[PDB]
Amino acid sequence: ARQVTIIGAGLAGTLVARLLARNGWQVNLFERRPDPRIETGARGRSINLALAERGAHALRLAGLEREVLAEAVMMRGRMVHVPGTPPNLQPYGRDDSEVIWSINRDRLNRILLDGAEAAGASIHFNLGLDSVDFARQRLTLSNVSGERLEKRFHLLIGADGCNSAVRQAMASVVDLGEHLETQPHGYKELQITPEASAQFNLEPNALHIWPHGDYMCIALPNLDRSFTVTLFLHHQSPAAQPASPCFAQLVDGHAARRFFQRQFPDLSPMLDSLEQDFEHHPTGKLATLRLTTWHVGGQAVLLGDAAHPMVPFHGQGMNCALEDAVALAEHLQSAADNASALAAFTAQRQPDALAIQAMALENYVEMSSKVASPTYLLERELGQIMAQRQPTRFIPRYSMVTFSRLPYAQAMARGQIQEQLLKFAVANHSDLTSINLDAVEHEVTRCLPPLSHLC
């Protein structure tokens, strides 16, 4: 049987472990953290994530989608909150098939671990990779105390996240050609209890947003009607707007409460544990990292966040990472040798990772605006008529990304054509009735070939 060692029993690494093990491979998976299925007296984990069609499809191929969705809350649309003003759903799509799902991250990881073991993978926890000797084909791991132990490997998969040690180790033998692009927002996890959720009548089946321009909060629902909230806020005030809010001014929980009472006056009273959460949850950093090189011959490959860290504003990191896992397993299963598989996987996935990294960055401005332009509104209206006239040609970029499996680069390219056609058609008009609709439709059929078999 073909042998593989995967570093990182997170979301992509556990999926790819199940796909390879079930297809005959002898799989060993090493994870730095303890096994989250071993119950302890520690506090419960509250991070959740949006699962969309790309990740759900990956799970479906793995036979795990039904299990994960039984523990997921449907989000039918965005619920945008701006003070005093009543929220109204902006639905994601036309019916409940076009929804995204809110799932507890720890639960998803526990379901994936059970899936990898059921397929025959061996998982070893409390061992973090420290280094790799590619010439000798040996790995060095240690527990939290740092005491080193070595393991031989044959094929190494780095599914070890944004600060991947496999990627770091690859720098010793290849030029990674890395481009690290910092992003100025940090983030902080907060919580709305089930009682406050109900008191303030927050719709459970929606993604909630409190836009505020250069900062914003989002909230995703849990099965118990609590919401996990994330504040995105600059670490530091930029040189030009030097008094503007940032994490550096929020020196403690009390300061954070004042900031929320001033800037998010409607959300603040929903957040009972703000002061505590602010002080005990560390502030997270965001970044986009692009790498020229994702593999070393047939010996080692990166996927998921180890290959392509991205900013979180599209909710697609996990979805892309599970899509990567499926592609990697497909290439490894059927290729002439591991070197061929890994080069082909990389060539396939790199243009798509670049496109979703860019679209993620672009998604911030959308989400964080308190008010949409009249121009933007009219473009959206016209787009809705086009989608109705030509649903296999005009499919909004958001939907191509979230509700289909169209390669991300293609979704980006078609989104660009759509953006230009709407922009030119709406210019110098203030309403639909002044727009030549057939002429727009003619540009749609001229410029956008039909796609079948999308949903």
Ligand SMILES: Cc1cc2nc3c(=O)[nH]c(=O)nc-3n(C[C@H](O)[C@H](O)[C@H](O)COP(=O)(O)OP(=O)(O)OC[C@H]3O[C@@H](n4cnc5c(N)ncnc54)[C@H](O)[C@@H]3O)c2cc1C
């Ligand atoms: C604030 C925020 C919100 C997000 N929201 C969404 C969302 O709504 N939807 C979505 O699709 N994505 C979202 N993401 C992105 C998602 O969290 C990641 O893209 C996804 O977890 C990547 O999966 P992965 O398997 O590559 O990495 P991970 O799931 O991070 O797993 C790597 C695993 O590596 C283990 N490990 C790390 N280093 C070592 C080592 N040296 N040795 C052994 N093990 C190691 C880590 O402990 C771990 O278990 C969000 C990200 C952030 C930061």
Ligand SMILES: Nc1ccccc1C(=O)C[C@H](N)C(=O)O
């Ligand atoms: N779901 C998320 C979870 C966390 C961070 C962002 C998102 C998103 O906003 C993606 C979704 N389609 C959205 O754009 O509304």
